[PDB]
Amino acid sequence: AWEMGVSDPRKIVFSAKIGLALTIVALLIFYQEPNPDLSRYSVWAILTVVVVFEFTIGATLSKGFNRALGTLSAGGLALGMAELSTLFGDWEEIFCTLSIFCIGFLATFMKLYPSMKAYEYGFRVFLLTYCYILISGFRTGQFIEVAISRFLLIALGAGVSLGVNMFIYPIWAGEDLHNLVVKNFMNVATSLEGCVNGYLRCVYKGYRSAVESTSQEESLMSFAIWEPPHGPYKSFNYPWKNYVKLSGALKHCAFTVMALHGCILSEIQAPEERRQVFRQELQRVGVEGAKLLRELGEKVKKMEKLGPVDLLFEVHLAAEELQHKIDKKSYLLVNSECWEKTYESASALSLATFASLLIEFVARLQNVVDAFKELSQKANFKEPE
Amino acid sequence: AWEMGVSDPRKIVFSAKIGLALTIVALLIFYQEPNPDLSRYSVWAILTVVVVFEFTIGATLSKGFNRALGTLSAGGLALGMAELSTLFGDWEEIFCTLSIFCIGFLATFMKLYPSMKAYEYGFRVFLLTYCYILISGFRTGQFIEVAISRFLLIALGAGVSLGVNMFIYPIWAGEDLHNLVVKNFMNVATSLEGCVNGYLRCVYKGYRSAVESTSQEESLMSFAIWEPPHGPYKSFNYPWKNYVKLSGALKHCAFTVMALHGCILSEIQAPEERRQVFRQELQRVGVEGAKLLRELGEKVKKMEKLGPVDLLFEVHLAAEELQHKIDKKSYLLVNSECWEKTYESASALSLATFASLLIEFVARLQNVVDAFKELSQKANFKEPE
Numbered sequence: 194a195w196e197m198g199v200s201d202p203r204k205i206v207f208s209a210k211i212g213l214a215l216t217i218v219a220l221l222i223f224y225q226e227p228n229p230d231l232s233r234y235s236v237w238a239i240l241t242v243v244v245v246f247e248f249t250i251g252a253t254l255s256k257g258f259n260r261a262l263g264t265l266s267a268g269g270l271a272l273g274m275a276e277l278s279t280l281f282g283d284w285e286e287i288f289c290t291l292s293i294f295c296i297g298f299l300a301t302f303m304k305l306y307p308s309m310k311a312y313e314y315g316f317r318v319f320l321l322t323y324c325y326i327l328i329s330g331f332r333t334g335q336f337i338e339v340a341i342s343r344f345l346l347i348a349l350g351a352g353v354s355l356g357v358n359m360f361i362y363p364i365w366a367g368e369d370l371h372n373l374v375v376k377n378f379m380n381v382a383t384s385l386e387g388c389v390n391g392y393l394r395c396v397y398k399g400y401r402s403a404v405e406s407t408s409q410e411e412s413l414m415s416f417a418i419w420e421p422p423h424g425p426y427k428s429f430n431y432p433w434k435n436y437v438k439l440s441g442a443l444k445h446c447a448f449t450v451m452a453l454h455g456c457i458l459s460e461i462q463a464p465e466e467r468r469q470v471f472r473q474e475l476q477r478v479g480v481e482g483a484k485l486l487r488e489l490g491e492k493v494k495k496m497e498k499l500g501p502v503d504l505l506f507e508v509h510l511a512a513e514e515l516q517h518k519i520d521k522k523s524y525l526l527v528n529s530e531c532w533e534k535t536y537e538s539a540s541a542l543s544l545a546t547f548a549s550l551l552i553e554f555v556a557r558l559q560n561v562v563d564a565f566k567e568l569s570q571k572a573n574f575k576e577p578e
Numbered sequence: 579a580w581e582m583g584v585s586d587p588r589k590i591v592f593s594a595k596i597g598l599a600l601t602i603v604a605l606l607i608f609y610q611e612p613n614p615d616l617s618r619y620s621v622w623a624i625l626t627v628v629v630v631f632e633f634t635i636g637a638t639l640s641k642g643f644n645r646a647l648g649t650l651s652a653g654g655l656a657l658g659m660a661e662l663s664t665l666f667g668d669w670e671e672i673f674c675t676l677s678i679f680c681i682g683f684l685a686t687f688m689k690l691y692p693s694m695k696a697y698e699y700g701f702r703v704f705l706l707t708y709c710y711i712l713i714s715g716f717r718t719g720q721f722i723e724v725a726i727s728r729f730l731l732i733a734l735g736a737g738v739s740l741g742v743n744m745f746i747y748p749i750w751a752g753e754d755l756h757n758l759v760v761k762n763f764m765n766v767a768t769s770l771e772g773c774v775n776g777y778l779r780c781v782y783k784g785y786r787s788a789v790e791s792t793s794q795e796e797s798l799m800s801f802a803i804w805e806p807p808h809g810p811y812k813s814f815n816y817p818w819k820n821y822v823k824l825s826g827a828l829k830h831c832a833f834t835v836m837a838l839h840g841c842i843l844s845e846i847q848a849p850e851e852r853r854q855v856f857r858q859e860l861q862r863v864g865v866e867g868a869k870l871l872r873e874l875g876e877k878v879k880k881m882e883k884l885g886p887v888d889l890l891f892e893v894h895l896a897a898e899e900l901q902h903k904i905d906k907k908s909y910l911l912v913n914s915e916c917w918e919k920t921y922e923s924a925s926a927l928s929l930a931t932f933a934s935l936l937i938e939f940v941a942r943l944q945n946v947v948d949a950f951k952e953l954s955q956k957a958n959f960k961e962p963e
């Protein structure tokens with residue numbers, strides 16, 4: 194839709210790039226030599242463009258490498274089996290059919306391995322190449338020059354797709370990974386404040402994005418290993434793994450925010466009157482946590498190093514003030530008459546679960562800070578000021 | 579390989595049925611009327627089998643319908659553009675390429691939409707068909723006649739694939755969803771027992787399987803609405819949705835088990851000598867919860883209605899006993915010296931969060947019992963023996 198396009202103009206550029214590659218191949222085939230067989234080999238290029246044009250440069254390179262491997266191995270095996278069939282002069286079609294059965298069984302069995310559920314697209318091209326070459330080289334024989342001519346057009350289609358994708362506003366998966374790591378910090382910072390305000394009032398996509406994106410940041414890292422150097426990422430081997438290490442460190446913290454959100458939806462809840470006693474300390478703790486997470490996101494975005502001052506001083510002081518406040522008024526959580534109604538006791542005891550989950554969230558930040566200090570060292574981040 | 583076959587005879591029969599379909603289409607192509615010039619586009623029949631075989635019957639029917647939609651629509655559009663092109667006799671290649679650019683841009687933009695992301699297979703067929711039938715039907719007036727031949731060989735291949743798939747050893751998605759619900763019930767019971775036993779020592783994939791299976795439980799439901807009646811499920815409109823409703827009540831219960839597992843990996847913990855005071859009540863609560871979950875799983879598996887007895891009496895009584903015990907020994911959770919070391923106070927206050935989360939887990943089971951009764955009435959479950 195128009196709103197979708199205006200919000201993200203990257204997709205419009207990608208669509209116009211694919212349409213331009215198809216237009217170029219079409220123009221060549223329209224104004225090509227009028228040699229015979231034109232309508233036969235013309236379509237192969239325009240149809241491999243639609244198959245090899247991927248969103249990112251690294252996915253294009255990886256998928257075209259696995260597709261070239263599958264096609265070359267299937268064609269070599271098909272030619273070897275076609276030559277071997279001649280020995281069974283009396284039984285030719287029987288041998289060819291039994292080879293098609295064995296190959297189909299083996300490829301279909303190997304694609305089902307748990308460790309190969311990602312590379313099915315190369316097993317399909319393997320089975321297609323073997324069946325096409327075995328069935329299109331029988332009624333005539335000596336089916337070679339044509340299988341060596343079809344690939345000189347598949348190559349042209351892939352060459353024009355690669356040139357158009359790479360040399361006109363390319364999209365790099367490394368920058369996608371960098372911007373996703375920057376986004377997660379702001380999502381978690383918004384969720385924490387939303388949870389505290391919701392509990393103290395007289396938040397889902399935030400931690401959902403940080404918890405549900407583990408595989409996205411691994412596929413982006415798989416694609417980024419093929420791309421050459423560019424921009425600020427100038428090095429033989431950029432440490433892309435420290436980004437995923439810092440993302441895991443942040444996810445370990447986002448699980449506590451998930452538990453704090455789940456406290457609001459519980460069936461058992463504490464009286465609103467007793468919540469207002471501890472309002473100030475909870476608001477200060479949430480404010481300092483959101484400030485620290487936005488500072489770390491801003492320092493990751495600019496590729497800057499940490500300053501000399503301690504970043505955790507204020508949040509630690511706030512958490513110690515909250516602990517003292519809980520200590521002074523603990524008599525509102527339990528009762529002393531029975532010391533030696535179940536619902537009322539559970540409601541009273543459920544406020545200390547919120548306070549303990551907030552103290553544990555403050556306790557888990559040091560690991561994210563250490564991960565950032567490691568990433569700013571492996572990658573030569575700039576000094577501040 | 580051998581282990582994946584002996585432990586799963588499904589994946590052997592599937593590969594053998596693919597090989598059988600390929601060898602029947604092959605035998606047909608090979609043994610043909612002496613005149614081979616009657617047809618030369620015979621690989622179109624063998625390449626459809628490799629593209630329209632799926633694990634389940636409902637997936638095959640749904641995907642075949644979505645592929646024939648795009649193919650017929652693209653062929654009609656291409657023939658309309660070809661007929662309208664002859665008006666501009668002077669410029670034919672320019673109009674054709676201006677049509678290809680627009681079609682590629684619209685198909686890519688429409689396939690990048692987030693909502694229509696499960697239908698990416700049907701958007702490539704449209705563009706491929708348009709380009710093939712516009713570049714191949716150039717300088718020819720009988721391409722309309724060619725088209726029908728190509729689709730008659732694609733129809734022969736799809737008919738053979740559907741017959742072989744549906745008449746040898748059908749694999750139904752309805753049974754897959756039915757088995758998945760029972761497996762999630764057993765996983766959640768095992769996780770609850772493991773966490774309660776782990777906290778008292780002198781579990782991980784269980785709740786994870788139940789929490790992350792929503793996409794599978796929705797795709798299987800989408801496939802299951804195409805399949806005809808068979809076996810136990812004998813009705814035109816089987817309430818497959820009530821299974822998803824019960825699985826979502828179970829997910830809402832599993833989130834508390836995840837929060838209980840998070841208490842074992844925390845930086846702040848309570849001394850064991852204080853944990854051992856409440857061992858019996860926690861152990862009884864966990865035993866009763868796991869017995870209730872396994873009873874509901876066993877009644878879902880057998881397709882039987884609930885008896886006249888009350889299922890929740892025992893666990894409710896165990897929870898009441900736990901609450902009374904917490905009331906009696908509450909002086910071990912707070913300190914009365916300062917009523918009016920921070921770490922030791924937090925460690926003491928962290929023991930009550932585990933018990934409050936266990937009480938919330940016990941409180942959330944009534945929704946699951948109500949959803950089970952709703953599914954037991956919507957689908958006619960047999961009365962207990």
Ligand SMILES: CCCCCCCCCCCCCCCC(=O)OC[C@H](COP(=O)(O)O)OC(=O)CCCCCCCCCCCCCCC
Nearest residue numbers: 237240241244649650651653654703706707710725728729
């Ligand atoms: C083969 C060289 C290029 C590489 C191909 C990529 C291989 C990787 C695997 C992907 C799938 C196989 C490749 C497919 C390539 C291909 O050529 O495939 C192009 C398509 C099939 O594409 P798919 O293989 O993706 O399904 O072929 C056709 O559809 C042509 C059939 C003729 C259309 C006639 C329609 C009849 C309509 C009658 C008129 C009435 C209309 C009424 C309207 C109202």
Ligand SMILES: CCCCCCCCCCCCCCCC(=O)O
Nearest residue numbers: 264265268269321322325340343344
């Ligand atoms: C989806 C169908 C795609 C087309 C599949 C057939 C293409 C044939 C291309 C042959 C590739 C080259 C094989 C070389 C084998 C060799 O020389 O040993």
Ligand SMILES: CCCCCCCCCCCCCCCC(=O)O
Nearest residue numbers: 622625626629642645646732733736
């Ligand atoms: C020669 C390259 C392409 C060969 C044909 C590949 C298979 C094309 C399948 C198109 C989708 C047809 C699925 C529906 C068929 C039907 O409804 O019977």
Ligand SMILES: CCCCCCCCCC
Nearest residue numbers: 257260261264347348351
């Ligand atoms: C249709 C599959 C094409 C496989 C080749 C991919 C591009 C590399 C050509 C050398």
